[PDB]
Design a protein around this motif. Structure first.
Motif, PDB file in Angstrom:
ATOM      1  N   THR A  64       0.817  -1.189   0.000  1.00  0.00           N
ATOM      2  CA  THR A  64       0.000   0.000   0.000  1.00  0.00           C
ATOM      3  C   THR A  64       0.852   1.239   0.000  1.00  0.00           C
ATOM      4  O   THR A  64       1.788   1.363   0.772  1.00  0.00           O
ATOM      5  CB  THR A  64      -0.905   0.049   1.214  1.00  0.00           C
ATOM      6  N   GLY A 109       0.637   9.862  -6.202  1.00  0.00           N
ATOM      7  CA  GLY A 109       0.296  10.063  -7.605  1.00  0.00           C
ATOM      8  C   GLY A 109       1.199   9.480  -8.683  1.00  0.00           C
ATOM      9  O   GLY A 109       2.178   8.803  -8.387  1.00  0.00           O
ATOM     10  N   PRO A 110       0.884   9.781  -9.954  1.00  0.00           N
ATOM     11  CA  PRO A 110       1.569   9.327 -11.166  1.00  0.00           C
ATOM     12  C   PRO A 110       3.056   9.620 -11.146  1.00  0.00           C
ATOM     13  O   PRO A 110       3.839   8.689 -10.976  1.00  0.00           O
ATOM     14  CB  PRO A 110       0.882  10.128 -12.264  1.00  0.00           C
ATOM     15  N   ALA A 130       1.202   3.271  -6.389  1.00  0.00           N
ATOM     16  CA  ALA A 130       0.974   4.612  -5.868  1.00  0.00           C
ATOM     17  C   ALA A 130       0.543   5.583  -6.962  1.00  0.00           C
ATOM     18  O   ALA A 130       1.301   6.462  -7.354  1.00  0.00           O
ATOM     19  CB  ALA A 130       2.219   5.116  -5.166  1.00  0.00           C
ATOM     20  N   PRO A 131      -0.692   5.443  -7.443  1.00  0.00           N
ATOM     21  CA  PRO A 131      -1.048   6.214  -8.628  1.00  0.00           C
ATOM     22  C   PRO A 131      -1.851   7.460  -8.336  1.00  0.00           C
ATOM     23  O   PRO A 131      -1.833   8.383  -9.136  1.00  0.00           O
ATOM     24  CB  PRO A 131      -1.897   5.229  -9.414  1.00  0.00           C
ATOM     25  N   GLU A 132      -2.519   7.500  -7.190  1.00  0.00           N
ATOM     26  CA  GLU A 132      -3.670   8.383  -7.049  1.00  0.00           C
ATOM     27  C   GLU A 132      -3.469   9.752  -6.405  1.00  0.00           C
ATOM     28  O   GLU A 132      -2.363  10.220  -6.171  1.00  0.00           O
ATOM     29  CB  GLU A 132      -4.785   7.664  -6.278  1.00  0.00           C
ATOM     30  N   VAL A 133      -4.613  10.355  -6.103  1.00  0.00           N
ATOM     31  CA  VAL A 133      -4.768  11.774  -5.827  1.00  0.00           C
ATOM     32  C   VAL A 133      -4.038  12.207  -4.573  1.00  0.00           C
ATOM     33  O   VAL A 133      -3.780  11.388  -3.698  1.00  0.00           O
ATOM     34  CB  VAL A 133      -6.272  12.113  -5.704  1.00  0.00           C
ATOM     35  N   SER A 165       2.406   1.022 -10.125  1.00  0.00           N
ATOM     36  CA  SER A 165       0.983   0.783 -10.067  1.00  0.00           C
ATOM     37  C   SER A 165       0.471   1.152  -8.704  1.00  0.00           C
ATOM     38  O   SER A 165      -0.641   1.643  -8.544  1.00  0.00           O
ATOM     39  CB  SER A 165       0.686  -0.682 -10.356  1.00  0.00           C
ATOM     40  N   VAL A 210      -0.459   5.300  -0.851  1.00  0.00           N
ATOM     41  CA  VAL A 210      -1.151   6.350  -1.554  1.00  0.00           C
ATOM     42  C   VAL A 210      -0.094   7.316  -2.117  1.00  0.00           C
ATOM     43  O   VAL A 210       0.862   7.651  -1.424  1.00  0.00           O
ATOM     44  CB  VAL A 210      -2.187   7.057  -0.633  1.00  0.00           C
TER      45      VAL A 210
END
Lengths: 122, 37, 106, 136
Positions: free
Chosen positions: A96, A100-101, A118-121, A116, A98
């Motif tokens: 896990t 971004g890109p 840690a992609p998000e907002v 993959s 959290v």
RNA sequence: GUGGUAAAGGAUGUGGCGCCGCGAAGACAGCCAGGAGGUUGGCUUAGAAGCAGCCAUCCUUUAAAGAGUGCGUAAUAGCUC
RNA sequence: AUCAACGGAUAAAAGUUACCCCGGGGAUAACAGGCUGAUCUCCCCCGAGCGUCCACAGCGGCGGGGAGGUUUGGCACCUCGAUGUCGGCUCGUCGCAUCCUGGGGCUGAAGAAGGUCCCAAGGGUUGGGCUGUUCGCCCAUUAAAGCGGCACGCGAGCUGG
RNA sequence: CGCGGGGUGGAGCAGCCUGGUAGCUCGUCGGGCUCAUAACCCGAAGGUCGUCGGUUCAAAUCCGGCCCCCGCAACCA
């Protein structure tokens, strides 16, 4: 961006959002802790039961909060300094993270799977 | 094995050597570096 | 097969010794016996932990104040040299335990 | 060791030249103009000897132990009147006859003599039977 | 490049020197085929019946006479000498 | 009459100074210099007896030779009308008997791994942990993480415990 | 590397330094008091005096240097 020991954000599998650093991992002389690199460091802050507990660890970069450059001169700053954690030579303990890109991260290309995870907002 | 000293014919039969001024002995066995030089 | 043991200032040490058969006594002596040095030294006594296999021993495995009154007195040097020298005889004796086992077992 | 029951406690010094002589037994050694030689070393000879002569070939040793030496106590400073003891040697000057008879025969000594020859702090020389002597 | 501040001991350095192997019925080689013919172990026999850990003290040939120097283990081979 | 600190100043006599002074002197130290090289630092030498067959891969007992001159001192003539005496940062630099990289040798070397032995300074050779410390322990190490020179490099450039 | 302090019967020290001679205590062998043990009554017993090599007609001793134990010593550099 660069660091011997310091306060630097872990945002990873520590039970709290910090790790103290130790130093750069490769070139003897270097001082600078460039991104796209693995590092020695340790948490100073607490944990909820958890697992990793107190001790010592070797692991890697995220972000900088101090000027990157791209070869294509893409640019991207961030008043905050999270960085990656790793077990053994390579593999990533927590499944896990959290985040971004982002750009420089995969480019070492020693640890593609992470991208993959840690992609998000935010 | 350039020993500093001694050297006394230890591959049994062995040749005294004279070269580069330097003086040695070699015989049939490499395990006989009698170069006291 | 006998029962090759070991020695370590103290006694009984960790828990080695088995059955030294066919000169197997010293066979592994210079091997296991010379267990590096328990990785840990503990103090500057330098206890000599031999190998009381069953002899007749077999295996064969400090502040720096002295130099401070510099430039002279091969006298007073000795004076302060005996001070600590006496501790050793009163240390290894009183300093019970001195057993740093549970290292690597090798 | 090899000394005892002293008359004194400390000799004085000298060294210039002297005289020994013929072999006893048609195997032996001899040297040059020696400095004193310590007893251990002196005894070391026979010590060095014993192993080699059929690890048993019996031999008379040789010259007797002599003079005292010491660094007083150790390495403080002079202050001593000159005393204390430890080690003993031999009067050694014309190249004394070394004693080496055995019957142990030939080279076995002769290289042990080289052993001896390589031993001991003076260049030496190698001897055996030669030309007699006579006494009343 | 010895002069050029060093021992020990190594040293077919080299020199000339006296002492002893010339056997021109001719050598030590260097060579080439032989390199022993009853020359084979009672103690290991796990094989040694030289060529691991265990004796060499008498004949046959005479080409020489290796009681056997050698490399090593199923003895042994097989190459030296 | 031990006036025996015995040719004796008295007939009768202690210390302490870092609160000191003031004279004189290198006709006595400390750091330093140098001296020889004692102890140390290192290299050979003999070869025991070991180490599946081994004396001389690996080592080295008993020994000897040294060399070298950084520690221990002995010394003590340079000097007391000024040799400012610990580490620290600065910036160095020689030297190699090498500590990582050269090139070999050698393996008790399948090979990689290593061990060991030559020859060679171009370089290079960390940040911290804590104490006055070099030193030492340790933590991650990283190709590696060496000694020692040079008044114990370095006060007219300091630090100052 | 000096000193000054001395090493004694099982243990304890006395006793010696003032040459021809070791004593005081428990504990100790055997013996009395007892249901048993202590108490308490008794006996007897038993000492190269750390070594040593010497002075000495003779040395626990006098004297010397080796052997352990006590204490004083070990400066500003």
């Amino acid at each position: 961006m660069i660091q011997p020991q310091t306060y630097l954000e872990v945002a990873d599998n520590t039970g709290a959002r910090k790790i103290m650093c130790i130093r750069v991992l490769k070139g003897s002389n270097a001082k600078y802790a460039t991104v796209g690199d693995v590092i020695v460091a340790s948490v100073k802050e607490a944990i909820p039961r958890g697992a990793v507990k107190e001790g010592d660890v070797v692991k890697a970069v995220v972000v900088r909060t101090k000027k990157e450059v791209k070869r294509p001169d893409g640019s991207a700053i961030r008043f905050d300094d999270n960085a990656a954690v790793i077990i053994n030579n390579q593999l990533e303990p927590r499944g896990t993270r959290v985040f971004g890109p982002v750009a420089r991260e995969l480019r070492e290309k020693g640890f593609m799977k992470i991208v993959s995870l840690a992609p998000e907002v935010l | 094995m350039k020993v500093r000293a001694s050297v006394k014919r230890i591959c049994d039969k062995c040749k005294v050597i004279r070269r580069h001024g330097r003086v040695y002995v070699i015989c049939e066995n490499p395990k006989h570096k009698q170069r006291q030089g | 097969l006998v029962k090759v043991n070991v020695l370590v200032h103290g006694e009984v040490v960790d828990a080695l010794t088995f059955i030294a058969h066919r000169e197997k006594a010293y066979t592994m002596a210079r091997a296991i016996v010379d267990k590096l040095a328990e990785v840990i030294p503990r103090q500057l006594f330098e206890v000599p932990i031999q190998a009381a296999i069953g002899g007749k021993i077999i295996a064969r495995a400090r502040k720096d104040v002295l130099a401070k009154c510099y430039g002279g007195d091969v006298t007073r040097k000795k004076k302060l040299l005996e001070k600590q020298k006496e501790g050793k005889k009163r240390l290894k004796a009183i300093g019970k335990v001195e057993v740093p086992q549970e290292a690597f077992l090798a | 060791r090899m000394k005892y029951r002293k008359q004194q406690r400390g000799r004085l010094k000298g060294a210039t030249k002297g005289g020994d002589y013929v072999a006893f037994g048609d195997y032996g050694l001899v040297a040059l103009e020696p400095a004193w030689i310590t007893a251990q070393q002196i005894e070391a000879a026979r010590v060095a000897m014993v192993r080699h002569f059929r690890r048993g070939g019996k031999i008379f040793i040789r010259i007797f132990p002599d003079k005292p030496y010491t660094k007083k106590p150790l390495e403080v400073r002079m202050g001593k009147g000159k005393g204390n003891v430890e080690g003993y040697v031999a009067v050694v000057k014309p190249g004394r006859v070394m004693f080496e008879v055995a019957g142990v025969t030939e080279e076995q000594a002769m290289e042990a003599l080289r052993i001896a020859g390589h031993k001991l702090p003076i260049k030496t020389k190698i001897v055996r039977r030669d030309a007699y002597d006579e006494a009343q």
